[PDB]
Amino acid sequence: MRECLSIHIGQAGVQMGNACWELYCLEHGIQRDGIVSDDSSFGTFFSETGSGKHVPRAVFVDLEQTVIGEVRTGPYRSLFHPEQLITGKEDAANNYARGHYTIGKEIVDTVMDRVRKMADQCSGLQGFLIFHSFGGGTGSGFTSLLMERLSVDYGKKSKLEFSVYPAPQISTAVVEPYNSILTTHTTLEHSDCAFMVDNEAIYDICNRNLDIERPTYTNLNRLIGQIVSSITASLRFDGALNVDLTEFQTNLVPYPRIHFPLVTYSPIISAEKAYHEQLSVPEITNACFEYSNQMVKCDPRRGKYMACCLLYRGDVVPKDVNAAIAAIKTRRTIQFVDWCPTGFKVGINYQPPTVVPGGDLAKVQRAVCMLSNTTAIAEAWARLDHKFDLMYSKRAFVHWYVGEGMEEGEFSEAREDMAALEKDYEEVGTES
Amino acid sequence: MRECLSIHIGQAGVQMGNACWELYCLEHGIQRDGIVSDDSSFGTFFSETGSGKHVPRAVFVDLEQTVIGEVRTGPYRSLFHPEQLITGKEDAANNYARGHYTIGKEIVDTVMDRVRKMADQCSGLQGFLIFHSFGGGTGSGFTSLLMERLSVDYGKKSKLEFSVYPAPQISTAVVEPYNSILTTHTTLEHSDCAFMVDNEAIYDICNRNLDIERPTYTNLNRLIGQIVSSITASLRFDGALNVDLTEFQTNLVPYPRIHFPLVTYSPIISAEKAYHEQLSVPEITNACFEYSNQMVKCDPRRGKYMACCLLYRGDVVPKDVNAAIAAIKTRRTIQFVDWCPTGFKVGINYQPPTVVPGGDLAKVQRAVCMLSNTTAIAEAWARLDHKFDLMYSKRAFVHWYVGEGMEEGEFSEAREDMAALEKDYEEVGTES
Amino acid sequence: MREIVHLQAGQCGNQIGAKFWEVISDEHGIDPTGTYHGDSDLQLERINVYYNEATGGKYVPRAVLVDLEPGTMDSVRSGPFGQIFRPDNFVFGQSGAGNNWAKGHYTEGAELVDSVLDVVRKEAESCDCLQGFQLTHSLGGGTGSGMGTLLISKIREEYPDRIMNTFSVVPSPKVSDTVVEPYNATLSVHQLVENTDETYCIDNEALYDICFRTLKLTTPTYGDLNHLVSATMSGVTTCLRFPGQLNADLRKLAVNMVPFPRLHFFMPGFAPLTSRGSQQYRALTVPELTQQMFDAKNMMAACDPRHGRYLTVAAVFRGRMSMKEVDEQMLNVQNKNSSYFVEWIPNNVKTAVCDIPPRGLKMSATFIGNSTAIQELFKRISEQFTAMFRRKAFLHWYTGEGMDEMEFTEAESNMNDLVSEYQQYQDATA
Amino acid sequence: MREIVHLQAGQCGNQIGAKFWEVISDEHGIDPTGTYHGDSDLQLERINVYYNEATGGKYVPRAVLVDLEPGTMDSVRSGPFGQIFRPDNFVFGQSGAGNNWAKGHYTEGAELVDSVLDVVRKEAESCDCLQGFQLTHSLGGGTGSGMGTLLISKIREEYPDRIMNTFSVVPSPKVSDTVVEPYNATLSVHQLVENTDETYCIDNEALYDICFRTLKLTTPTYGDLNHLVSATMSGVTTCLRFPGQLNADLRKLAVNMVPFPRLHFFMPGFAPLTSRGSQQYRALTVPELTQQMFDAKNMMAACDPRHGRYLTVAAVFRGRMSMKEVDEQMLNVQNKNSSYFVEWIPNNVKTAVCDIPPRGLKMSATFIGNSTAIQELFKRISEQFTAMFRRKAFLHWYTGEGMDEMEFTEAESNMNDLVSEYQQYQDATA
Numbered sequence A, B: 001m002r003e004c005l006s007i008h009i010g011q012a013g014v015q016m017g018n019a020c021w022e023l024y025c026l027e028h029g030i031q032r033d034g035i036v037s038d039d040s041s042f043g044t045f046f047s048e049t050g051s052g053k054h055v056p057r058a059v060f061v062d063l064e065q066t067v068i069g070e071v072r073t074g075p076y077r078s079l080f081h082p083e084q085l086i087t088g089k090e091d092a093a094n095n096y097a098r099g100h101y102t103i104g105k106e107i108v109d110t111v112m113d114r115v116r117k118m119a120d121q122c123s124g125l126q127g128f129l130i131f132h133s134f135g136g137g138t139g140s141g142f143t144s145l146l147m148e149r150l151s152v153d154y155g156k157k158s159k160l161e162f163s164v165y166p167a168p169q170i171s172t173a174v175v176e177p178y179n180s181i182l183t184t185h186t187t188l189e190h191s192d193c194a195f196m197v198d199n200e201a202i203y204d205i206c207n208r209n210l211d212i213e214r215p216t217y218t219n220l221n222r223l224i225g226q227i228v229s230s231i232t233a234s235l236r237f238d239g240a241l242n243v244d245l246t247e248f249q250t251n252l253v254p255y256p257r258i259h260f261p262l263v264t265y266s267p268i269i270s271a272e273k274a275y276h277e278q279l280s281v282p283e284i285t286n287a288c289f290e291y292s293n294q295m296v297k298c299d300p301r302r303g304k305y306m307a308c309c310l311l312y313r314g315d316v317v318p319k320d321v322n323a324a325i326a327a328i329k330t331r332r333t334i335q336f337v338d339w340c341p342t343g344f345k346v347g348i349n350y351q352p353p354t355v356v357p358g359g360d361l362a363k364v365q366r367a368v369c370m371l372s373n374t375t376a377i378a379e380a381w382a383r384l385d386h387k388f389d390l391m392y393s394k395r396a397f398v399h400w401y402v403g404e405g406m407e408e409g410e411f412s413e414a415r416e417d418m419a420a421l422e423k424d425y426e427e428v429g430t431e432s
Numbered sequence C, D: 001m002r003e004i005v006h007l008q009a010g011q012c013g014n015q016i017g018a019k020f021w022e023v024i025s026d027e028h029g030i031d032p033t034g035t036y037h038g039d040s041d042l043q044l045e046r047i048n049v050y051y052n053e054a055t056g057g058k059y060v061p062r063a064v065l066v067d068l069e070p071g072t073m074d075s076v077r078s079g080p081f082g083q084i085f086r087p088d089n090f091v092f093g094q095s096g097a098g099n100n101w102a103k104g105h106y107t108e109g110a111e112l113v114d115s116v117l118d119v120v121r122k123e124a125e126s127c128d129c130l131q132g133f134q135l136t137h138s139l140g141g142g143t144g145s146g147m148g149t150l151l152i153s154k155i156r157e158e159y160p161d162r163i164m165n166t167f168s169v170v171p172s173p174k175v176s177d178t179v180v181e182p183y184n185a186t187l188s189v190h191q192l193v194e195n196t197d198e199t200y201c202i203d204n205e206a207l208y209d210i211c212f213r214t215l216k217l218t219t220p221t222y223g224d225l226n227h228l229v230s231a232t233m234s235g236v237t238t239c240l241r242f243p244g245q246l247n248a249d250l251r252k253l254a255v256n257m258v259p260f261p262r263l264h265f266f267m268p269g270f271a272p273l274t275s276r277g278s279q280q281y282r283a284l285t286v287p288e289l290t291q292q293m294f295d296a297k298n299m300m301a302a303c304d305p306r307h308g309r310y311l312t313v314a315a316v317f318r319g320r321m322s323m324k325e326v327d328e329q330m331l332n333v334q335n336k337n338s339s340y341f342v343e344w345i346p347n348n349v350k351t352a353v354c355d356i357p358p359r360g361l362k363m364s365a366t367f368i369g370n371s372t373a374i375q376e377l378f379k380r381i382s383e384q385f386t387a388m389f390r391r392k393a394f395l396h397w398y399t400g401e402g403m404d405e406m407e408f409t410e411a412e413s414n415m416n417d418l419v420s421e422y423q424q425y426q427d428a429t430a
Ligand SMILES: Nc1nc2c(ncn2[C@@H]2O[C@H](COP(=O)(O)OP(=O)(O)OP(=O)(O)O)[C@@H](O)[C@H]2O)c(=O)[nH]1
Pocket: A009, A010, A011, A012, A013, A015, A016, A063, A091, A092, A093, A094, A095, A099, A132, A133, A135, A136, A137, A138, A139, A140, A164, A171, A172, A173, A199, A217, A218, A220, A221
């Protein structure tokens, strides 16, 4: 498949990006200096300079120099194009209004210029990849600007985004409920399907599945990088049942306003513990449908699955996949909504996951990534909305947003839009 | 092609000349001492002594010994003919009247004598190159004298001139509005097409495109030298679609009073930043039509293009040029005046730009120079005229000009001539 | 000479095509580089059926490969037989379909269809007597479903007199591969139910069963299922290429197999299919092959034939054969399976024999069945299309591409008519 | 023997000339130094057609190179075949034209024209039977347009009975190379529309398309397009130099191709044109060449022939050939393309065959077409001349050289008459 474009906005997105491109360079054998030295389809994410060099096709953006400064001084400094590392002067300070109205407006024009140039060199553009934090100043306000600009300027193209959905129990900021809803209202229409991941859920995986007692954001991004790699494996390798970028939205978006699938990955085992497990297709296939293995704290058993995409990767046999999927569908504890008799979208690629040196993930020749648009996320939305209205009833932090060029009316409109989204899940969750 | 004559008048023109001839000597492998030691068509700009020496065919003129004294004491001292370095006694002191009436008249006769001798050795003379500052004493008053003398004495020959058009915001002198208009009125009729360049625009290029934080007039002249070299590349090398000197005026002068095209050049990248860009024909071709890359601060998007000359240079493929030009013409943001269905004049030469040691410009095997007669310059003329009438309403500095042999009536006549020029652009800027 | 042009669209289309010319070239002894290395003159006597000779001791297969993304076709170029095809026939787009019938038919495929027909027209002009067309695709797929139907309608309009075969992979009943298969199948059947003369329905579920038990293959892959499919597809045209006592071409099968114009959906089969361990303990003779081919477990279709009846059956044999034995077993099947054939058709078997067998086998047979049991297949899709379309489960993707909701209901009704017409003829006069 | 003198003016003129004698010399086996090294006596049997023999085992091509600046001619001298021409024939000026038709016709070229005709007269006197003249130039160019027309008028006045061919590069419709092309073309057509017997219109846009897809050339250059042009130009005179079953000289083509005196504008073509990868998968036979030459995509003119009709077509073949095959395909083109030929001309094809093929090919054919579709070309120029001249966009350059504004309007009207006359004969009697 042809080119796919990547965008990294905010500290979470930027830090995820360097982990994602660490895998991409390792998978294709590209050195950290931008020269290939160990699969010719790497042009999907890289542009050849014409002099034995490859420039990653990403646009790292932030309103502060700190996070991008690390990239400029890191090992991958020579990799990225200098102009792609667009940076501002002052951070959004966790305020949505700043990243969307005041400071975001000053730097949005420069971002589009680079994005336009990236498109000019495209013989074919499947879509965009946008990495951001669902709750945060730059990752919620500036992303909405790009979504509006990209949709109107380009349109008719897939727009995939990865979001750090706020964990129900764990939270590292105070005004996240305000920030998450504001971006959801503005990004719901211009998005195609946003993959959601929690920090708490990955921590639990790193503690139960993996034997790591000292995890860090660096570990999480490395465990999130393979999620992105598997999703784009078809565009970069060959295998039966190829899944193009645009196929994800068609299969996983029954309705325009329900495009928030969750992410699961398997196997996830340490080097020592791998010796004691066969890791056959049924084992990993069953693991993907375990509450203990999903990367979103919402309980899958609390709702019903509407659509599921199984991107099998490695030395897998299609017959085993069909038998394994049949076993899942006959389970009574698992339940799929009646109006969708067929929910599984299988994808097989002949490229086992690459081993990241120094990582906490063991070498496996057979891995699978599951994307499931499940109604269980409706409970998470209600809890997030419950936090918002409780704060907004007293104007806990509204004055900061008001002074940054955002009218108080948007809070009411945004929550009502969220309320309708809750009703939409309720409507599709029952059948006669 | 046969000989072309160069004239350098004023500090700006003289300092530009030494940069222009630095490129010419480097391009043809001529040592700074006037001896060839590394393309036999170098006779266009050089005359062979007959004893293994080459004399550049230029006439450096100034009313003060300071600027020319540097040339006499510089490395190229042995290069130029001693009599060509014509110098006066007292500078024009930024007064147009002095350089045209009082002190300019004393030295004009000697200049013509040398010019006549240069023509005597011509088997064929395409035209003249005159370097001067659009605003300045010697570069505005003395140039008008030469234009009148050259036109009447020779005539029927191209007369190209490069002018440092006053920047709208940046200005290094107080009475420039008086000086610029006076020379424009007297040089409009006797000129064929005057290429315009600003100091502010080149500074911006040196800061954004190049990574130079400490530019100087020396850097600007070096970045302006390649403009002149590209224009005369056809006369000195071989390649498809050769563009003779007289072809420029025919294509870029739809009307006798509209012959003020602007200059753009690409690629302009530092040594380090070049490694991250392919620099294909479409990339440079699109860059030439970018507001951020043109060397005149006037916004190209604020008007319409009437004629354009694309002097492609290096290892370019004619098919790529045609496809790239087609892409430009289909853009909707760019707009060409209706009465000129065809505006592009392509020129291809097989000689990549030479590398100037110690320069801020990287080595590129594929470069293009764009000359575009655009109506956007009309706004610049109005702003310059706005400065003139505001000063002249109070006779801010008229007494200096009056005492130097210039009648007050010329100020009114010159401004009215400028006013008609503004109307001429308005007339050609609309179609039924 | 009777000649055919092969068309392959979509991922399943091209891959089966690739594993089809890997077998046709083997029968005719054609080297992957295109040069002929066969050991018998009887192979070149009818090579022109699938190949257009290029002077220089090489042959080029007149095949047209269509795909909206280049991923599937790029792999074909890198295959053992990739260099065999003419580079000009490789026609592809840039924006691949998102498994939506609309994009592969109305928006994306509409622009590329003109390019495809031009190559097809040149191939037809290169022939002396064109007999029909062959299309390989998958109903659940978007490109094949959408682009395949668009091509079928155009060539049918251009060449109404010529036949056109279709080997379509049909969605399995238990485990699927695309979420929106019900929409793609119903839309595509709506076009194939009036444009094509005979269609062969294949499902991977049934092929998986064959490998598991009939062939005892522990780790099968699509590299193996396609080989089984290619065997049947090659068998259907054994007569056009090699001699035999009773030759049956594409048209002869169509007349003997298509009683009514809309009832042209068949279920293919093959025999013998035995593992390496079982090769010792079985005799390769006519009496054994007849049982295997009529066995419900050897069927390449999920629907059990015993749940229905056979309107028409066609047996294509290969290899050294005895006519009386062939006649005997078919008579035994007619008498033994008394209730498996309709009463309003006294004779239900169309027999064909070819002298040369396939590959190293000394005997082969191909089974074609126009059984009424296939109604349970459209009925299942009929229930899966209704349940989704009942509340517009995934319609907003098809609507956005131009398709109107009205076209959806017409195809559902046109699908219900097909099932009713199958149930109608399952009756008995007495 | 029938003999010709070649004239080349302007940058495009000389460069195509240089890539033309690089090919004529190859066919006759003439060394760049001028000595003959051919392997067959049949090449020297008609060498005198383009060459004047100089005693000493060397031949000199009677060609006249005209250019107002010496830049283009100096490069020719430094070329591989620069030393082949007689030094005296290199006639040039000092002040090159500024792409203005006026300077190359009235002011600058007027002084040098006398010098050019003197060489031309000597070349004519060196011949025993002069058959015609050939001019290579470019309508958009100033020197070629201006100086070419001046030469054509003088030689036509001097040699009215003799023919004169013109291979003129015509401005492309989408991307141009000179701003003032509309003025140069209209002024030049005003002279060629009454002075020359046949003209061949070529556009680089069409040649770019051929290289991109028909020939899959990634980085073409004028060194390559000129080679294609030289192939057609050499093909037109294959008969004057080599034997064949059905010989057609310049005059024979003119009578078969020029129905009315003003309708003498043709669109050339060539075949086969295949890339190196495609050489394996194509058969070089008469049936394939006929399709390629009538294909709109193989045309060397931007205008689509299908938008018009053919008054007359001339096919010049080369190499070992079968007359019946040639007759068959032309008949098929006549019947297949029913509406592509006028009704008031029952026969539209003039066939010619030569025994020797070009270079290493074993078969070649050249296509000449007097199609009515060329009206869309002058119409486009007619719109681009009107829009500019409507408000005197660039007239002050032509006026300053002596041209009066009245001459401009007469050429526009004489251009409108040509388009009207083309549309007039596109009609049908019934
Ligand atoms: N998984 C993961 N999450 C991160 C990482 N860095 C930040 N986050 C999440 O981001 C959330 C807060 O938003 P940030 O992304 O940090 O802020 P931002 O995107 O830079 O926007 P600003 O408000 O302008 O700073 C925190 O709750 C973290 O959970 C990371 O490296 N990995």
